[PDB]
């Protein structure tokens, strides 16, 4: 009675990688 | 014009951090939709297993949050860009800004709460029931210096509100894009390591099953 019971992974490598993408690229939004 | 490069400039990052806004409701809406999946599987476990019967895991609920940080990346377009506009439609960013830093912190400490009590739950299930499960064990996580960080960047914005002044909004608004950019390193962080601890937990309650 307990066999199927079975906890999810979570996947936001997506969200992250574009957080880190936005950091970045906002050197470019920077006033000389 | 030096007023259009900066009105240009000003807008680009804008439409940046609305990017991370959107982006960082979407993990957080995961974090909280998988971490609540899983302290219903190991409730569940329990009722279906006397010295257990009342161990239980907790939910989260950041959709109040969640749904902040939305708000402020659509609410931003009103920020969008006349030393005077700038001026203002600037500092009207930053305090929008400065919202979704606040209330990301909160989410991302509402998760670490949940996610360490549902380790130790788990953990608590094991020791009760303990050869072959005895040392399954959940990983706590600790993101505090990131929260810490998140509100020390909201405080510190203030700093960077504008009050030959083309120089003093050019500086000002750099100021801010270096705060924002720390506060998105962090949270970037932060998100990482609340994925992992979900994601070990969801191994180790697995675990658990599979060998029970």
Same mark, same amino acid.
């Given at each position: ?9 979570? =996947?936001?490598?997506? #969200?992250?990688?574009?957080?880190? #993408?936005?950091?970045? =690229?906002?050197? #470019?939004?920077?006033?000389? | ?10 807008? @680009? ?44 895991? @907790?939910?989260?609920?950041? %959709? ?24 203002? %439609? ?33 953990? *608590? ?8 499960? @005895? ?39 750099? @100021? ?10 962090? *949270? ?18 697995? *675990? ?5």
């Amino acid at each position: 009675d307990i066999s199927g019971i079975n906890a999810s992974v979570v =996947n936001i490598q997506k #969200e992250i990688d574009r957080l880190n #993408e936005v950091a970045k =690229n906002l050197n #470019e939004s920077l006033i000389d | 014009e030096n007023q259009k490069l900066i009105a240009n400039q000003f807008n @680009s990052a804008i439409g940046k951090i609305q990017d991370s806004l959107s982006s960082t409701a979407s993990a957080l809406g995961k974090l909280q939709d998988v971490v609540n999946q899983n302290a219903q599987a190991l409730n569940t476990l329990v009722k279906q297993l006397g010295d257990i019967s009342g161990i239980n895991a @907790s939910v989260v609920n950041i %959709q109040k949050e969640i749904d902040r940080l939305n708000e402020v990346a659509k609410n931003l377009n009103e920020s969008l860009i006349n030393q005077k506009l700038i001026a203002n %439609q600037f500092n009207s960013a930053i305090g929008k800004i400065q919202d979704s830093l606040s209330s990301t912190a909160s989410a991302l400490g509402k998760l670490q709460d949940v996610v360490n009590q549902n380790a130790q739950a788990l953990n *608590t299930l094991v020791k009760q029931l303990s050869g072959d499960i @005895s040392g399954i064990n959940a990983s706590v996580v600790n993101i505090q210096k990131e929260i810490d960080r998140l509100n020390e960047v909201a405080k510190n914005l203030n700093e960077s509100l504008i009050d030959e002044n083309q120089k003093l909004i050019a500086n000002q608004f750099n @100021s801010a894009i270096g705060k924002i950019q720390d506060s998105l390193s962090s *949270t970037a962080s932060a998100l990482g390591k609340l994925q992992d601890v979900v994601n070990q937990n969801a191994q180790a309650l697995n *675990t658990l099953v599979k060998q029970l």
